[PDB]
Symmetry: none
Subunit: 172 residues, 6 copies
Amino acid sequence: MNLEKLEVSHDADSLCVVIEISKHSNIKYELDKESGALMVDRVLYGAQNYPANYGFVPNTLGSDGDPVDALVLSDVAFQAGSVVKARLVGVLNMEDESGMDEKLIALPIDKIDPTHSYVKDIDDLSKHTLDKIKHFFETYKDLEPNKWVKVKGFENKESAIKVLEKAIKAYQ
Amino acid sequence: MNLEKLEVSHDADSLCVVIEISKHSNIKYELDKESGALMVDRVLYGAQNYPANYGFVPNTLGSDGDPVDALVLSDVAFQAGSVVKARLVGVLNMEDESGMDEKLIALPIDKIDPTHSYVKDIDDLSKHTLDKIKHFFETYKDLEPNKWVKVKGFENKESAIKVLEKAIKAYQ
Amino acid sequence: MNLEKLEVSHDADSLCVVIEISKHSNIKYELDKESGALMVDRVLYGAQNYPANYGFVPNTLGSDGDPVDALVLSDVAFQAGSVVKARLVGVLNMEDESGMDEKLIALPIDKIDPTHSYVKDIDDLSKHTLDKIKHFFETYKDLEPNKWVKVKGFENKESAIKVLEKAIKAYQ
Amino acid sequence: MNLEKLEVSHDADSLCVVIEISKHSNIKYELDKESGALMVDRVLYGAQNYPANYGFVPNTLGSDGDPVDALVLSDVAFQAGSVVKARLVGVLNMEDESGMDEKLIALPIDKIDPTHSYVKDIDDLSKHTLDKIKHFFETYKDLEPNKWVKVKGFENKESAIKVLEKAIKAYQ
Amino acid sequence: MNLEKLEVSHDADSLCVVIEISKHSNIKYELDKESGALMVDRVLYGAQNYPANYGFVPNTLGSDGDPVDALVLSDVAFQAGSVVKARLVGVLNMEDESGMDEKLIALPIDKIDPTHSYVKDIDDLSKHTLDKIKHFFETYKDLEPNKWVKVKGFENKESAIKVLEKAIKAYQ
Amino acid sequence: MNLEKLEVSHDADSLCVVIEISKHSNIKYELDKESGALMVDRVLYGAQNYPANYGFVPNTLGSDGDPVDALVLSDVAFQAGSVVKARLVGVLNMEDESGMDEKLIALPIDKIDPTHSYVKDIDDLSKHTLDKIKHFFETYKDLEPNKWVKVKGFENKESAIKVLEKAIKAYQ
């Protein structure tokens, strides 16, 4: 694709998110800005698999040299490489070997899939949900040499929203 | 099915193993001796999935009130409920909330699938392989309340063989 | 002594390690660069004692503001303050209240003590050996207020080697 | 020796205690009633060592099928096998894998060693003292398969005294 | 009073329960069968207080030499000494220094107080409720010398019902 | 109220203490500096209640970002929000999830209530008294998720005094 010519939406409730990892995939792909090609970045060393679609937000820069990463919780898996509009429902803050790499939590626009419209904010997520996600991120790199992750916890939409604009200006 | 009328093989290189979990399945089934029906025992609380087919050996009793559990490493997934002939290549010893529940390591008879005939003993497994399996077992129950697991390590076929007979007499 | 005028060896199989804690000692000494004097850093609050000689590598800087710490497994205890040539056989990765402080695993040069020449790499260590050390590190600070330790696990020589050079350049 | 022909003292302030583990020893010996020979019972799996002399009281039966165990806090280590007169200053209650195995807390008769005469009752023990002992018991068997310990806490002399007579009648 | 001339009801849903401790009281009274007078049995050594009315069931004998103890969860406190008709909703099983002393869980007859009619069985109790009660019993005697309590957990009405008849026949 | 215009006394034997929790109350209130209003901070999850009036010392800063907390043992309960002059008789040191939060032990000026004038220092408190308070603090948060407390023990007036000035300069 061509991120350059892609209408980007930065509305908390209409967020343009490029997917890189489809839910349940243990293969971590990674789009390369120039080619626009998916780069197989790494296979999960352990017997695990992403708890939800994972991607990143176009035209944003956060404390990690890369745009702010994001999750789009849903019952389906969006083909790695596809694009989807989501809404910020919260965010999972954590630090790892590089430093602070927060992870915005989100769902697709109801227009796309109203299955979980009711989840208006982070507290609207089952406990189990939050646990599996947290535990995942704090264990999906145990077997990776020279690589760790310390998961702080989740936060509400407002916080996320903040994290958002924060990285947005940090972009240009 | 009817475990009662099933020819059981206890030859280390011809071991009759009833499967209960097909590779990659995050659903832990569990056959009930009387009904002969698969009982959904539990779904992985975490974003994980078995690293290889898991089942148990017929007519054997080990330190856990259940027949000795077993893994049948293979590139394919055997339909939960099916039966397969394997051969002991080792065993992963560990203890959990209940106590000592060793897990035999095995592959299907070459006649069935010669893909990995060359793996004559535990040392013939890729490091990664052993790591993924070990790590799995020592984290697949983190989120389960009142439930832990301490994985000791692996052992050679000989050790396994022992564990086997040990539980075999312990049966009748 | 005078670390400044000490021939340092950074060959994985000829590593110059300054000892600070002799095996079995519950007294954690700590050399001070300027004075070159052993500083009693702290006495084990618990009823324990180091599983092997503990020291550090001269002229190296790791993620802890201090040179990469190291262990020199042997049957004898080297006088705290002495220097010894070891060889990297692995490394124990872990994180604590400060962050990531890996611990190189090593033995003295066979020329010095050929007792355990055969241990060419981490896997050549008795399970028990690895357990006592791991457990030790993950419990030797329970009683210490505002201080914790999360032991990840061990790794092979190669990994260690890497960890080494990594901190070596990080030095100058 | 011959426990049978040994004048036993059951006075709280003149208690006959047979030692089986000298302070700092990581070797847990265990006298056999008939032979009267020290039986090496087990070596500490971890990098620890007893915080004080450990023994048991002759001709007493507690809830563990064995005479009530006891500690004899002192600055020295009494040769495993030796006998010593102590006085009850308290007791450390706890339960483990078998059940309830309380541990009397005591010191030798001042006549023998007046170093700590002032410690008339449990409260007279430094905090650190009590912590190290408690911690010890609740971690000296972590690495032991199928074996745990839950340490409740300590109690005053009166309590201990009770525990004593209780197991004393429970003897004959 | 005169337990002897008191119409006793042993219907699971019309259980005659003599109160000895009113909810929130830290004073444990204890009726004496002959005098029919409340015996102050003991004051809570700790800064606690009963989570609900406590008493016992007339003309019943359980494994403790005393009638089966019982709780009558309600928003009010019944004057120690008074009698009340409850209904078994479950039971909290536990063991202590003496042995097995189960504690029936119950509420008063709706006719008396319909506030919690809807709680038809143990599961109908708020988590918090069950926690505070469990925790209470497993900590209300920490400071009591030579006295402990191991709380197993709760069970459904059916279980309780059983425990009931069990101790009822065990009476005469 | 208005802490700002309140004559504060920092004399060990004339200590100005703002009460926030009246003895026996299970409701932990918490004055807010600006509003001067009692903030209901939290209700005891367990079946407990404070062993004595709890409050804090005005214009003081300790290692917890809050003024140094304090207890005013007395037979009566002072209306949460009221102010009272006490005298340091000791202090209970302890650490929790946050860190070191010592708790000054004190009584009201004899002029106010001479009932316990005789208690000149920590040793003058009944054992029971000290046990119930210690045990309380080390169990009043068991049921609280992500929250623990490690009670070291008590100390004499002198110690307390120290702790006082310490936090006093730490204020301005």
